[PDB]
Design a protein around this nucleic acid. Sequence first.
RNA 1: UUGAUGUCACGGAACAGGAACUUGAACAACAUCGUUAC
Length: 76
Amino acid sequence: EGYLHVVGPSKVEFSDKKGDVINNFQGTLPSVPNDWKTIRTNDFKNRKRKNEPVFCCEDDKGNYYTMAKYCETFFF
RNA sequence: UUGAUGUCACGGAACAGGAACUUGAACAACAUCGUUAC
């Protein structure tokens, strides 16, 4: 039994340079959701081994958003 | 609220002394954000 430490989705990297993990995609990446408790994961950084998931994104401009951190913490 | 036979109060400048002063280039490069894996 214990408390849940939930801080939200962070560890985000945003740019316009079209980095390596935003390019290796399956096309038509979605736009930015308006609230949390809704942002789910989209792709994997490693594809042969099911390692760390990511979330590639976009907006009305050419800003590319990638995000790690698929977990929260819990102290008991 | 006066008292008578005697009021120059128009008989008297609120006047005389004290620096809103001292100190200050409209200028500029290194990051921000947190977790993943056994």
